[PDB]
Scaffold this active site. Structure first.
Site, short mmCIF file in Angstrom:
data_model
loop_
_atom_site.label_atom_id
_atom_site.label_comp_id
_atom_site.label_asym_id
_atom_site.label_seq_id
_atom_site.Cartn_x
_atom_site.Cartn_y
_atom_site.Cartn_z
N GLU A 35 45.86 36.00 48.24
CA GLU A 35 45.05 35.79 47.02
C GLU A 35 45.37 34.38 46.48
O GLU A 35 44.48 33.63 46.08
CB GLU A 35 45.38 36.85 45.97
N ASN A 46 34.07 32.58 40.45
CA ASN A 46 33.14 33.41 41.28
C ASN A 46 31.69 33.04 40.96
O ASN A 46 31.40 32.63 39.84
CB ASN A 46 33.38 34.88 40.94
N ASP A 48 29.30 34.77 40.12
CA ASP A 48 28.77 35.58 39.02
C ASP A 48 29.22 35.08 37.65
O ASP A 48 28.83 35.69 36.61
CB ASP A 48 29.09 37.07 39.22
N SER A 50 32.42 34.88 36.57
CA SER A 50 33.76 35.37 36.23
C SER A 50 34.79 34.38 36.97
O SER A 50 34.42 33.53 37.81
CB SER A 50 33.95 36.83 36.69
N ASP A 52 38.88 34.41 38.71
CA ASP A 52 40.11 35.14 39.12
C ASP A 52 41.35 34.27 38.83
O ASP A 52 41.36 33.07 39.05
CB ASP A 52 40.10 35.41 40.63
N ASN A 59 40.52 39.44 37.96
CA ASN A 59 39.17 38.97 37.59
C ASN A 59 38.84 39.22 36.11
O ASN A 59 39.14 40.31 35.58
CB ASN A 59 38.19 39.74 38.49
N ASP A 101 43.01 52.50 39.43
CA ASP A 101 41.62 52.66 38.88
C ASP A 101 40.74 53.48 39.83
O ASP A 101 39.66 53.85 39.47
CB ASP A 101 41.00 51.27 38.63
#
Ligand SMILES: [Cl-]
Ligand SMILES: [Cl-]
Ligand SMILES: [Cl-]
Ligand SMILES: [Cl-]
Ligand code: NA
Ligand SMILES: [Pt+2]
Ligand SMILES: [Pt+2]
Length: 129
Positions: A35, A46, A48, A50, A52, A59, A101
């Site tokens: 990562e 990203n 979209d 967002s 990280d 994120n 989650d």
């Protein structure tokens, strides 16, 4: 901060990641390696909109607030900047919620594509732990 491999393995073990949700320490060290290459200050935007953040590339769409991700949540209840600290506490604490989650470590795409099913033990091999 750029952690060493065994250095991060010790820090992650101290903070309770070894076998957390059934994932051995090697899985978490691998996920960090791919990562962020072990760099707490890693960031990646990203498409979209967002971002990280940190050693585990957490994120802003779900997990932290950066003030620039429209419509997003803050489920770890922290500014994303907290994920960039030399101190990994906010990242690990937030990662424990993420891996709880439902989808386990599949939440980290790099973990699924590069660590899952591999000899993750290699990542902690040789480390005093
Ligand atoms: Cl390495
Ligand atoms: Cl392991
Ligand atoms: Cl936002
Ligand atoms: Cl699982
Ligand atoms: Na957010
Ligand atoms: Pt330490
Ligand atoms: Pt801790």
């Amino acid at each position: 901060k750029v952690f060493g491999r065994c250095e991060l393995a010790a820090a992650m073990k101290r903070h309770g990641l070894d076998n957390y949700r059934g994932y051995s320490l090697g899985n978490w060290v691998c996920a960090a390696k791919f990562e962020s290459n072990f760099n707490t200050q890693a960031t990646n935007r990203n498409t979209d909109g967002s971002t990280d953040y940190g050693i585990l590339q957490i994120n802003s769409r779900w997990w932290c607030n950066d003030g620039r991700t429209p419509g997003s949540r803050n489920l770890c209840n922290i500014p994303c900047s907290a994920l960039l600290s030399s101190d990994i506490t906010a990242s690990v604490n937030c990662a424990k919620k993420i891996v709880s989650d439902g989808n386990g470590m599949n939440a980290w795409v790099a973990w699924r594509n590069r660590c899952k099913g591999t000899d993750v033990q290699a990542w902690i091999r040789g480390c005093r732990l």
